[PDB]
Ligand binder design. Structure first.
Ligand SMILES: CC(C)CC(=O)c1ccc(OC(F)F)c(O[C@H]2CCOC2)c1
Ligand SMILES: [Mg+2]
Ligand SMILES: [Mg+2]
Ligand SMILES: [Zn+2]
Length: 326
């Protein structure tokens, strides 16, 4: 009850950017995804809205969480929980108030939860270069992201795991399509085109009487949800520094382990994966400058000024990492 009391206290921050997700992972007995998803579903009244039995939700979440690899440093259940919670916060931004339906909200949150499930800790390119079964199955195209979807949906069919059992056929059809569109958009090979389209939307942005974003067709609606989850996936450098540094520690461990496998095969070691020749700090500054800040600056423009503090933190963290180089 004492550890449970402390966990409940920490979960009171579920609506805040910079939640202590690593603390929650420890306090929950390595069940951050289950406890954070359960909390968010309760917070958003999703169990009642979609008639989800609580035991079914918990059973699915525990099984989903189990299919993240405990021995992968970055792409594990803590990352999934973090992306879920970040998406949850982004969904609540004033500029999107009443924009999305309950089904669309469910899609975005569910997509976030499953988006990296059964990740092996190596990149799509590694899987392609090594002639893996995954790459063979998926014809070198969004190899991991296709797999995450297949696993996430497949687990719904396990005993007492169908959390969507009380949705209508049309609701299930719509949800499935939206979730596929969102998770496939987390493939970094799609980033530049996704960002280009987001910029176009910002340039042509329209708002309602209430000052809320106007999205009146599927293409625009799904595009915003795709970029939202993608922003959440790329949110580490926008978090308070003590969180960001832990994420960087973890991704570098994962990258180095891949580089060790490439070194042992006689392959050229991938960028940033050589533990004997890797500038962690320069790499983060480049990551922010070329990928994360261009994305987040554009998201911030879409919802201006809702995300100014997130953007300010990103810029501060970029400055901090840069300062360690000279
Ligand atoms: C974006 C993709 C979906 C996951 C990814 O590759 C990823 C996520 C977070 C990273 O850093 C930090 F925020 F934790 C990261 O750093 C690499 C790249 C630059 O130097 C090392 C890579
Ligand atoms: Mg596992
Ligand atoms: Mg991924
Ligand atoms: Zn991810």
């Amino acid at each position: 009850t004492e550890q449970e009391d402390v966990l409940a206290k920490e979960l009171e921050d579920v609506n805040k950017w910079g939640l202590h997700v690593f603390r929650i992972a420890e306090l929950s007995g390595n069940r951050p995804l289950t406890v954070i998803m359960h909390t968010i579903f309760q917070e958003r009244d999703l169990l009642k809205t979609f008639k989800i039995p609580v035991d079914t939700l918990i059973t699915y979440l525990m099984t989903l969480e189990d299919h993240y690899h405990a021995d992968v440093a970055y792409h594990n259940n803590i990352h999934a929980a973090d992306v879920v919670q970040s998406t949850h916060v982004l969904l609540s931004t004033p500029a999107l108030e009443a924009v999305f339906t309950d089904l669309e909200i469910l899609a975005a949150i569910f997509a976030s939860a499953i988006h990296d499930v059964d990740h092996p800790g190596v990149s799509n390119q590694f899987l392609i270069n090594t002639n893996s079964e995954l790459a063979l199955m998926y014809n070198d195209s969004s190899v991991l992201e296709n797999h995450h979807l297949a696993v996430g949906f497949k687990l719904l069919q396990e005993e007492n795991c169908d959390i969507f059992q009380n949705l209508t056929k049309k609701q299930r059809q719509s949800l499935r399509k939206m979730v596929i569109d969102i998770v496939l958009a987390t493939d970094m090979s799609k980033h530049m085109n996704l960002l280009a389209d987001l910029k176009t939307m910002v340039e042509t942005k329209k708002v309602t009487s209430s000052g809320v974003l106007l999205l009146d067709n599927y293409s625009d609606r799904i595009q915003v949800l795709q970029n939202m989850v993608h922003c959440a996936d790329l949110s580490n450098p926008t978090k308070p520094l003590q969180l960001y540094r832990q994420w960087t520690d973890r991704i570098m461990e994962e990258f180095f382990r891949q580089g060790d496998r490439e070194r042992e095969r006689g392959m050229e070691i991938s960028p940033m994966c050589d533990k004997h020749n890797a500038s962690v700090e320069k790499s983060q500054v480049g990551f922010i400058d070329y990928i994360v800040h261009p994305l987040w600056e554009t998201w911030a423009d879409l919802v201006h000024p809702d995300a100014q503090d997130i953007l300010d933190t990103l810029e501060d963290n970029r400055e901090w990492y840069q300062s360690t180089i000279p």
